[PDB]
Design an enzyme around this catalytic site. Structure first.
Site, PDB file in Angstrom:
ATOM      1  N   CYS C   8       0.928  -0.759  -0.012  1.00 13.38           N
ATOM      2  CA  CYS C   8      -0.067  -0.224  -0.356  1.00 13.38           C
ATOM      3  C   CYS C   8       1.099   1.216  -0.022  1.00 13.38           C
ATOM      4  O   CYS C   8       0.276   2.357  -1.253  1.00 13.38           O
ATOM      5  CB  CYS C   8      -0.934   0.250   1.295  1.00 13.38           C
ATOM      6  SG  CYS C   8      -0.406  -0.354   2.783  1.00 13.38           S
ATOM      7  N   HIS C  78      -1.788   0.845   7.305  1.00 20.33           N
ATOM      8  CA  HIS C  78      -2.931   0.908   6.701  1.00 20.33           C
ATOM      9  C   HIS C  78      -1.738   2.786   5.327  1.00 20.33           C
ATOM     10  O   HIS C  78      -2.675   3.635   5.943  1.00 20.33           O
ATOM     11  CB  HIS C  78      -3.958   0.993   6.325  1.00 20.33           C
ATOM     12  CG  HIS C  78      -4.623   0.983   4.535  1.00 20.33           C
ATOM     13  ND1 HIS C  78      -5.351   2.182   4.264  1.00 20.33           N
ATOM     14  CD2 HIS C  78      -4.562  -0.489   3.320  1.00 20.33           C
ATOM     15  CE1 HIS C  78      -5.766   1.903   2.524  1.00 20.33           C
ATOM     16  NE2 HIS C  78      -5.358   0.883   2.269  1.00 20.33           N
TER      17      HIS C  78
END
Lengths: 321, 321, 321, 321
Positions: C8, C78
Site C-alpha cells: 500500500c 495502511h
C-alpha cells in the site's frame, strides 16, 4: 692491476699480449673490457678476442694469436699459465697474410700501437676505434642507434611457453600465477628463493626444470655489436650452465642482444645442438631497440646438426633500426 | 625531500608516480609510509604498494602500476632509475577494468586525487582513508581494535623450541640459561654481542645457528592491517637474511603481526619453501591483541610446495578480537 | 503491483513519482527497495528517499520531492493519499539549483530516466548505479568491501551490560544464565516466549525491561551504505517501539550497520535524546566487516540535546575494514 | 449507542434532548457529529450546539436549551449526569420568542422533527439541512466551495516566527534546522519524540516552549462553517492545553479554518486574552481554500481586553472565494 681482486684472467694474458708487442695499462684494460672495469670473473680467450678486435681491427679468426706460445689453464675458479691448457701467441704467418690486404701495417704490428684498419693509420689507443672487426662477416643485422622501447610485460612471453616448473634467473621477479617459480638472483637481492654470484655461473644443485628463464640485462655502450660482446660472457656462463638444469623435453628462454660477435655465435651453436628446435624472437616485451630473446625448445641433451642460418634470417627481420 | 638522507627509494618512485599523475608532498610521504617519516632505508616496490593502496584504494594486484615504463635498480645499498631493473608505470588497461566496477573514477585517475573507493568520491588526500585495499582478499582474520595484553615471558616460548646455538635479533636481551645465545641489537644498545643498523638487514658474517629469533617490534598505528604493512619490510629484511644464518635442521622464530598485506604474504611464501614445517603461533607471551609468532621448523634450504592455507586457519583461530 | 499484499506504501508513491515524470515497473521497484521484493510493510517517505537516491543520484535533502503536491496518510497499518498527511511532489526550484552544479540535466528531469550524476549521463535504469547520494555528507566511515568475521559469541557483550530483566528481539536465542530473558521472535520460530510479525513493530503489551536487545540481521547487498538503507526501517520500527518497553534507567542494545543514510541518522537522533549516554560499539562478537552495535544507556524518556558527533568519531575508528 | 466505547458525552445528552422531544438514532448521531461516527472523546455542550443547530436551524444563543433542567458533570475523562455541573434543558420562553419570527413552528418543537427554518417546513431529519444557524451573525467571511491549493512549504511560515525551542503537535514532521524541535504525534506514528491520544489533549509534563505549533488537520465535509465546527474541539483541547506549554514571551501557532461557529469563537476569545497580540494569517503555505493559521504572539498568561474585531477584518480579506 692495482686494487683488482677477480682479474686473474687479465694477468693470464699479459704474457700472450707481450708476444705481440702489446702492453695495456689499467685504463686501456678498463675501456676495452667492461668486466675488467667492474672487476669480475671472465675468460682469457673471450677477453683476448676483445683486445685483438680493438688493437688490430680484426677478431681471433684472423689467426693473429693462433701460434701456440703461451698456455692459459683453468683450475677451480682461477686462471694461471700452467702448461696443458689452450695456447695462444702472436703468429707472424697470420700477420703476413693481413699485410697483403693492408700494406701500411708492414713492420708495425709489435710496437704497442692500435692498427686502425678503417683510416689506414697506426695511432695510439682510442676507446672509440675498432669497435667491429673488419674480417668478420656478421651473422645478422644490427641497429645503427640504441633507442629505448616502452614495451609489453615479459610475463606475456613467458606464459605462452609450455612448462610448469620454472627457474627464473633475474635481478627482479615476474608475476607467473600459472607457473611454479623458483627465483634465483644476484647477491644482495631480497625476496628471492636463492642468491648466487652469477659471474660464477648457476650451480647444478638448483635441480632440473621444464622452463629456464635467463633474464639478465647488459647495459648498452658504444654500439649493438659491443652490447653483444659485453653480454657474451653471460650467454657462455648462464646459458651453458642452464643445460644441467633442464628436464627432458624442457626449454631455455634467454634475454640477449643477438650473437653478432664470434664468442656469442659459438655459445649459440653449442646450445642449439641439444634442443629439437631453436628460435630467435623479438617480441613486444623488449625494453630496447637492440634486445631479443633466444627460445631453445624441447631439450634432449643431444648433438644434432645446427647452423645459425634460420636464426640469421629471423634476426634480419627483427633488427631493422 | 628536504633533510632526508636515506630516502633514495622515495626519489626512485617520483618518475613512476608521475606516469599516474601523482605528486606527493613531504607531509603525504610521511603520513603514508612510516619509514619515510623516520628516514630509513626501504624498497620502492613495497612503498609503491602502500602509496597505490592509499591513493587508489586498491593494492598492486589491481595492476595499476604494471605497465613497464620506468625502472628501479638496486646497487650497493642505493636505489636509482637505471634501466635493467624491475619496471613500473601507470597502466590504462588496468584502470579501464576498474572503471567497470567503479564508474565514478572515469577520467579522474591522473589528477593527483585520492580515489576513495569506499564512499564513491574523489577528494584530496586524507591519512585516515583507504587503509585496506578493496581488491585484496585478506588471507586471515584481523582485529577491529588494538588492545595491550599483560602476558607471559617470551623465554617460556623460546625454551620449548629445540636448538642449543641461538641468535637473538632484538632491542633487549632474554634470559636463556639452557641456550648458548649470541645477542644482535640495533645501534646504540649496550650489553649486546653485536650491534648493526637492522634497516640494512643481518650480515652473513654472524654465522649459522640452530635457532634464529627475530624479536623486533613495530608500533601500532591506525589498524591491524597497517601494523602488518609497517612490519612488512622487517620480515623481508630480517626474515630473508636469516636464511644464510641457519644450520641444517635449524629453526626461525619471528615476532610479527600476521601477513595481511600483499608484501608480508610474499615473504612468508618464500620462507615457507625452505623448512619441513611452518607454523603461525599466538602463545601467552604476546604483548598485544595483534601479535603473533611465525615458527619455521627444520631448515633444509629447499624449495617445496608451500601455501598459506594452513597458517590462514591457524591465524583465523588466533585473531578473534 | 500484481501478487503483492503489503505494498500500500508503494501504491501511495505512484502519484508523487508521477509529478517528477517517474514511473517504475514491478522489476525496478523490487531492485531499488528490498521490502518491495519481499512484500513487506514500509513507509512511503523512507522508500521515496531510496527511489530519489537511485533515480536522481541525490537523497531527499536535495529538496527534489519537497513541493507539497501529494499527501501520504497513515491510518491503522495502511497507507493511502488522504489530505492532511505529509506532502511530497517534484520541486522545479530544487531541480534549478542542481542544474547549476549539473548542467547536463537541463530539461531531462521529468522523462523517466536515471540521472547518473557520477558519470555525467542520462541513461535507462540500472540496479548498480547511484547507490550513494552525491549531495549527502556521510556521518562516518564505511567499508569498501563486505567480509565475514569469525568472531566471539554475543553473550560476552550482553553479559557486560547491566539489567537483570532482558527482552531479546531475535531470530535465535542466546544463553544468558545471569539474566531473566523474555525471547520475542519472528513468526514460525519455535522455542520463543512470544512470536510477532516484526515488520509491524513491537507491541507495548510486552512490558518494560532493564535491557532491550534488538538482534535482527539485514542481509548484505551491493555496499555498506545500502546495508544501512536496507536496515533503516528495522531501526525505525524496532528501535522506536522499544522506547515503550524500557523501565526508568534501562538500556537499549541494537545490532545494526551504522547510520550512513539519511533515515538511519534521523532514528538515532530521536533515540539519543532519551538516554543519559549513547554509544556506538564494534566489539569482537560481530559476524561481519559492516556490523556494529548501538548501546543506548540509562533511559529517562527525556529530550536532551543530542548530536551524532561522538558516535561519528567512534564509528570512524570502528570502520576502516 | 452499540459498539461505541468513548461516547459517554453522547449518553449525557439523551436526557437533555428528551426535554426538547428529540430522540436521535445512531445514524443521526453519526451524521451530525463526526466525533460520534469516529468514536472519540468530546464535550456534551459542544455536541449540543451542533445538534441544536441541525434540528432547530439555530445555535445555542437562541436559548432553546438554556432552562436548567439536566446537569452534565465532568470527572477524570468521563461525563455523566451528576448534579452540580452545567445545566441544560428545553426552554419554552426561548421557543416562544422564535415563534414570532417563525409562525409555522407553533406546537411543533417537541415532536422529534427537524425545524428547517430556511425553507419554512417541518420534515424528518436530513444530513444536508440546517448546516448554518440562521440566528448567528458570522464573525467573518467563508468560502462557497472547498478547493485544494498547491501551496508552499509550512517551514517557510514557522522559520519566520521567533523562538528557538519548538513543540510540534502534528501527524507528520517538519524540517526546522534553525529550531530545537520536540515532535508530539498521534498514536501509532513512528519517528516522533512522543505519542499521545490527542483527543485527550496535551499533557503539561511536555514542558514550556518558545513556539508551540498545533498542526492537526480536519477533513472537509459539506461547507466551510462545518469544517470550523468539526475542527472546534481540537482548538478547545490542543489550543487550550498549549497555554501550560508556553514560556514567558512565547508564541502559539495553530493551523485552523477560522472561528465561524459559536464554540470556535469562544476558544479564540479565551486564548487572545493571554498574548500581547493575536493575528489571523492566510499565508502561501496553506493546503486548501478554507485554511488559515492563528498566530498568538508574546505570551504573558494575562487577562486583557480582547475582541475578535481585528481578526474579523483580517479573515474578511483572507476568505474571498
Amino acid at each position: 692491476f692495482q686494487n683488482k681482486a677477480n682479474v686473474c684472467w687479465a694477468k693470464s694474458l699479459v704474457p700472450i699480449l707481450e708476444t705481440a708487442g702489446i702492453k695495456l695499462n689499467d685504463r686501456q684494460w678498463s675501456q676495452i673490457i667492461q668486466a675488467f672495469k667492474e672487476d669480475k670473473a671472465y675468460s682469457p680467450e673471450v677477453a683476448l678476442n676483445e683486445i685483438c678486435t680493438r688493437m688490430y681491427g680484426v677478431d681471433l679468426d684472423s689467426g693473429l694469436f693462433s701460434k701456440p706460445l703461451v698456455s692459459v689453464y683453468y683450475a677451480d675458479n682461477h686462471w694461471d699459465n700452467r702448461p696443458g691448457g689452450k695456447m695462444f701467441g702472436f703468429n707472424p704467418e697470420a700477420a703476413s697474410i693481413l699485410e697483403r690486404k693492408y700494406p701500411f701495417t708492414k713492420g708495425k704490428w709489435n710496437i704497442n700501437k692500435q692498427i686502425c684498419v678503417t683510416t689506414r693509420r697506426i695511432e695510439d689507443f682510442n676507446p672509440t676505434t675498432n669497435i667491429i672487426p673488419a674480417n668478420r662477416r656478421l651473422p645478422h643485422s644490427l641497429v645503427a642507434e640504441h633507442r629505448p622501447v616502452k614495451g609489453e610485460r615479459m610475463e606475456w612471453l613467458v606464459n605462452k611457453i609450455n612448462g610448469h616448473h620454472v627457474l627464473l634467473v633475474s635481478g627482479y621477479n615476474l608475476a607467473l600465477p600459472t607457473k611454479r617459480v623458483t627465483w634465483v638472483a644476484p647477491l644482495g637481492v631480497r625476496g628471492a628463493d636463492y642468491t648466487y654470484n652469477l659471474e660464477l655461473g648457476l650451480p647444478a644443485t638448483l635441480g632440473r626444470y621444464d622452463l629456464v628463464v635467463i633474464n639478465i640485462h647488459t647495459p648498452f655502450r658504444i654500439h649493438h655489436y659491443q652490447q653483444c660482446v659485453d653480454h657474451a660472457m653471460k650467454l657462455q656462463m648462464l646459458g651453458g650452465d642452464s643445460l644441467r638444469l633442464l628436464k627432458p623435453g624442457g626449454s631455455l628462454l634467454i634475454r640477449a642482444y643477438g650473437y653478432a660477435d664470434r664468442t656469442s655465435e659459438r655459445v649459440i651453436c653449442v646450445l642449439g645442438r641439444k634442443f629439437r628446435s631453436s628460435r630467435a624472437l623479438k617480441p613486444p616485451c623488449v625494453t630496447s631497440n637492440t634486445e631479443m630473446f633466444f627460445l631453445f625448445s624441447n631439450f634432449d641433451n643431444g648433438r644434432r646438426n645446427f647452423t645459425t642460418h634460420v636464426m640469421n634470417n629471423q634476426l634480419n627481420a627483427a633488427f631493422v633500426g
